Amino acid sequence: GVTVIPRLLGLKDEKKIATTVGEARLSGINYRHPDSALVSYPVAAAAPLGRLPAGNYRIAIVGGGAGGIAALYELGRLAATLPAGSGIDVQIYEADPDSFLHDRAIKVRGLKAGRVSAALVHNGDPASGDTIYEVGAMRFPEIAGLTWHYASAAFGDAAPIKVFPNPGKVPTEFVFGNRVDRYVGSDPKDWEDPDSPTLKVLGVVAGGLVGNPQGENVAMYPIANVDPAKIAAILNAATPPADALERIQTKYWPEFIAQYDGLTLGAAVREIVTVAFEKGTLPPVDGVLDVDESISYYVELFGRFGFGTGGFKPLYNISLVEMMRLILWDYSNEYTLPVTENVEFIRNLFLKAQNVGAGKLVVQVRQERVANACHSGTASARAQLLSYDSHNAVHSEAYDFVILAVPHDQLTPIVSRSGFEHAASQNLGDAGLGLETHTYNQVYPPLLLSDSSPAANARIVTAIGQLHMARSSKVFATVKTAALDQPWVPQWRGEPIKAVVSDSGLAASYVVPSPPEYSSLLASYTWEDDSTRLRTADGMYRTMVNRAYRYVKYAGASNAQPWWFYQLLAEARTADRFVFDWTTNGGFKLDMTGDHHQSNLCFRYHTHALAASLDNRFFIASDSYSHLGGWLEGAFMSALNAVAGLIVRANRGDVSALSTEARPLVIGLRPVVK
């Protein structure tokens, strides 16, 4: 997802760096997000979420990504508490033929858990395996409590982790227009030019967006009349005051949303810069630029710099609300897991789910694509799924409960083609693909919010269908580690520059750890519009290298030469150059202005379980239905919601079936039903 570190500190000499799963798990155990400010999800997840009545349940999970697998794990924790004679049967549907779930020696590489997967690229060298480049989930914030919670389930607290060397955490070169900086962190003493305008605009914009944890409030967009930095401290507290979290949940965060959800991040940056320029805090850029040109230069300069770990420019259209969520979720470091491939995290969680079930959870995998979900009739197994196998044969199955653990663009066709009210019958399936249909009687929509309002039912489906997928592309290569020591590679702070943030088209480029003779280079990580500007792997790689072929003037040398980084990219080994272009080939929800109302409806959907007679058997579980798209943390939160709702539904609306700690997952939100 989007790395947002307001007050960037260099890694060198930074203290309190976590070295195990357990150490990271502790850092975010208390953090509560502002849309769910009554509950720490890691605390909710510390014990089984609640209790089910005695019975033999049949549940489906559609999707084997982080969402579906965390939901499975929570169902295992529940299963274990059932009495003798009782248990849960789960059918997990996963259409992806390369899913870890369908893997039947040596460990098979390159398996997927949805958007957690690595590309396996031939390198030539027979003494090594294939080169591995992670194309989805890569690194995990210290504050990601629920993620580290599940990592402990998967690997144990003792398992070692390594720090991720982001841009700005290590010596970095930044290039925007005519401006060049070399830097680490945000202390002027660690900038090659301590008087840099980049450092000046960083201070102004971080000050205006985040403000200060102590003393006077200096931020432009307060929450509860104070700086966001002060609110973040409350949300992260082990033991905040009576009613403080309630008031954030019901008053002050909704008031911030009401005021600022129609304001983009780029618009907010410009408002801050304009005030600082008028105040004289930001000086004219030089003796030539007019007022608007100066302000615009600073806005764009900030745009490419961000907070120092890569630019926010391509994210300028996101709502200030969405940016503010990330600002509140404050951290200094991200870490990698002790795995060869990150799919191992989700696979280990799947295996652990079965373990914690204590024999009361039985799982069966189906290599089938779900085409339709609906309710049929009013009896006990009223949740229907219509699916197709690898031979395109149709299958229909009925369940007590279903968790739809697929992101929004994949969920749409499953939930939107059965209308919005009761129907005497429907012939469902993929008729346009020429596939067999199946007739269902007394059909109700799957995402059933009302027995009397088709508009209510339409709202959830139309909301899902209009969420925004943020897109990104990555270009990977492998370079001799010694290349970083060529005489033409500059050094800063006693180290070769290994990270580059630039307006060249590459956006962000850096050496990535090996979870050595060779080093992995993320030659380009581009977001949104930056991912389509340049529109054989080596051929495509050369087009990117050609963008780096630019003359760069440095304050040192009187004659500009081709950028050194061009020469570094050209040192990349030829065999294992790899382009992950989303438009030829990974997207996650990131909210635009006005999108809160759609994403938050999804977030709260599981509260339908409070309405007993509605008897809706479908829950949703994905980072698409969270307020942290682009992070496993969001997928995991949504799965925790889904299973908390399922428990309440199983108990006919009785919230006392949830644990004391889990209860606010449902009752701490505005319900979606009367």
Residue list 478-517, contact with a second copy (CB under 8 A): 503, 505
**How many other CB atoms are there within 10 angstroms of residue 485's CB atom?**
10
Alpha-carbon span 657 to 139, nearest angstrom? 35
Exactly one of 9, 61, 544, 647 binds a second copy (CB under 8 A); which one?
Answer: 544
Q: Of 3, 469, 34, 401, whose CA–CA distance to 246 is shortest?
A: 34
- Interacting residues with a second copy between 177 and 196 (CB under 8 A): 177-179
Question: Nearest approach, Cβ of 445 to ligand FAD (angstroms)?
Answer: 17
The three-class DSSP label of residue 137 is: coil
> Binding site: residue ranges?
1, 67, 94-95, 115, 136-139, 370, 525, 622-623, 630-632
Question: Nearest approach, Cβ of 551 to a second copy (angstroms)?
Answer: 4
588: contact with ligand FAD by CB under 6 A: yes
97: contact with a second copy by CB under 8 A: no
Exactly one of 314, 634, 645, 653 binds ligand FAD (CB under 6 A); which one?
Answer: 634
**Helices in 499-617 by DSSP H: which ranges?**
537-548, 564-570, 596-604
368: contact with a second copy by CB under 8 A: no
Q: Of 401, 371, 256, 319, whose CA–CA distance to 629 is shortest?
A: 319
Alpha-carbon span 554 to 492, nearest angstrom? 14
CB 588 within 8 A of CB 470: yes
Tell me which of ligand FAD, a second copy, none is bound by residue 139, counting a contact when its beta carbon lies within the kind-specific cut-off of 5 to 8 angstroms: ligand FAD
Exactly one of 20, 196, 336, 598 binds a second copy (CB under 8 A); which one?
Answer: 598
- Interacting residues with ligand FAD between 85 and 124 (CB under 6 A): 93-96, 99, 114-116
446: contact with ligand FAD by CB under 6 A: no
CB 138 within 8 A of CB 580: no
Q: 294 or 531, CB closer to ligand FAD?
A: 531
Exactly one of 19, 392, 532, 660 binds a second copy (CB under 8 A); which one?
Answer: 532
The encoded tokens of residue 28 equal 């975010």
94: contact with a second copy by CB under 8 A: no
The three-class DSSP label of residue 193 is: coil
- Interacting residues with ligand FAD between 320 and 379 (CB under 6 A): 369-370
Using alpha carbons, list the distances in angstroms from residue 479 to 110, 159, 184, 536.
22, 29, 23, 19
The encoded tokens of residue 13 equal 């000499």
Q: What does DSSP assign to residue 250?
A: I
Question: Nearest approach, Cβ of 266 to a second copy (angstroms)?
Answer: 4
Tell me which of ligand FAD, a second copy, none is bound by residue 166, counting a contact when its beta carbon lies within the kind-specific cut-off of 5 to 8 angstroms: none
Using alpha carbons, list the distances in angstroms from residue 630 to 3, 12, 318, 660.
10, 28, 13, 29
578: contact with a second copy by CB under 8 A: no
Exactly one of 78, 132, 484, 545 binds a second copy (CB under 8 A); which one?
Answer: 545
Q: Which residue is listed with tokens 């410009």? A: 270
Tell me which of a second copy, ligand FAD, none is bound by residue 286, counting a contact when its beta carbon lies within the kind-specific cut-off of 5 to 8 angstroms: a second copy
Alpha-carbon span 367 to 201, nearest angstrom? 52
* Contacts with ligand FAD, 392-411, as mask; x by CB under 6 A: -------------xxx--x-
466: contact with a second copy by CB under 8 A: yes
Q: Of 379, 396, 378, whose CA–CA distance to 451 is shortest?
A: 378
**How many other CB atoms are there within 10 angstroms of residue 150's CB atom?**
30
The count of chain residues that interact with a second copy, using the rule CB under 8 A, is: 101
Range in contact with a second copy (rule: CB under 8 A) among 453-461, 607-615, 630-638, 651-659: 453-461
Exactly one of 31, 57, 100, 140 binds ligand FAD (CB under 6 A); which one?
Answer: 140
334-336 and 140-141 strand pairing: antiparallel
Q: Report the Cα 230 to chain-centroid distance in Å.
A: 24
Q: Of 237, 301, 224, whose CA–CA distance to 270 is shortest?
A: 301
241: contact with a second copy by CB under 8 A: no
Question: Nearest approach, Cβ of 387 to a second copy (angstroms)?
Answer: 15
Q: Of 342, 396, 400, whose CA–CA distance to 93 is shortest?
A: 396
Q: Of 334, 333, 332, 330, whose CA–CA distance to 232 is shortest?
A: 330
560: contact with a second copy by CB under 8 A: yes
The encoded tokens of residue 604 equal 């709260």
**How many other CB atoms are there within 10 angstroms of residue 668's CB atom?**
18
- Interacting residues with a second copy between 252 and 281 (CB under 8 A): 261-264, 266-271
- Interacting residues with ligand FAD between 25 and 64 (CB under 6 A): 62-64
- 546 in the Ramachandran plot: left (φ > 0), alpha (ψ -120 to 50) or beta? alpha
Exactly one of 25, 32, 33, 139 binds ligand FAD (CB under 6 A); which one?
Answer: 139
- Interacting residues with a second copy between 300 and 359 (CB under 8 A): 300, 303, 313, 316-317
Question: Nearest approach, Cβ of 409 to a second copy (angstroms)?
Answer: 5
Q: Name the residue type at position 457.
A: N
Give Cβ neighbours of residue 233 (< 8 Å, ≥ 6 apart): 213
Q: How many CA atoms lie within 13 A of 346 on its CB side?
A: 29
* Contacts with ligand FAD, 459-498, as mask; x by CB under 6 A: -------------x--------------------------
413: contact with a second copy by CB under 8 A: yes
294: contact with ligand FAD by CB under 6 A: no
176: contact with a second copy by CB under 8 A: yes
Give Cβ neighbours of residue 74 (< 8 Å, ≥ 6 apart): 45, 48, 49, 639, 640, 643
> Binding site for FAD: residue ranges?
1, 67, 94-95, 115, 136-139, 370, 622-623, 630-632
Alpha-carbon span 93 to 400, nearest angstrom? 16
469: contact with a second copy by CB under 8 A: yes
Alpha-carbon span 632 to 136, nearest angstrom? 10
Q: Of 670, 652, 658, whose CA–CA distance to 607 is shortest?
A: 670
622: contact with ligand FAD by CB under 6 A: yes
376: contact with a second copy by CB under 8 A: no
Question: Nearest approach, Cβ of 440 to a second copy (angstroms)?
Answer: 11
Question: Nearest approach, Cβ of 14 to a second copy (angstroms)?
Answer: 33
Q: 175 or 235, CB closer to a second copy?
A: 175
Q: After which residues is the chain broken (C to N over 2.5 A)?
A: 104, 515, 535, 585
520: contact with a second copy by CB under 8 A: no
Tell me which of a second copy, ligand FAD, none is bound by residue 412, counting a contact when its beta carbon lies within the kind-specific cut-off of 5 to 8 angstroms: a second copy
Exactly one of 5, 209, 245, 299 binds a second copy (CB under 8 A); which one?
Answer: 299
198: contact with ligand FAD by CB under 6 A: no
The encoded tokens of residue 281 equal 């805090």
Q: How many CA atoms lie within 13 A of 271 on its CB side?
A: 13
Q: 396 or 466, CB closer to a second copy?
A: 466
Range in contact with a second copy (rule: CB under 8 A) among 47-55, 221-229, 347-355, 429-437: 429-437
Q: 112 or 182, CB closer to ligand FAD?
A: 112
What is the layout of strands, in order, in the sheet containing 87-93? 361-366, 87-93, 56-62, 401-404, 618-620
Site residues, ligand FAD (CB under 6 A): 1, 62-68, 93-96, 99, 114-116, 136-140, 147, 369-370, 405-407, 410, 414, 472, 586-588, 622-623, 630-632, 634-635
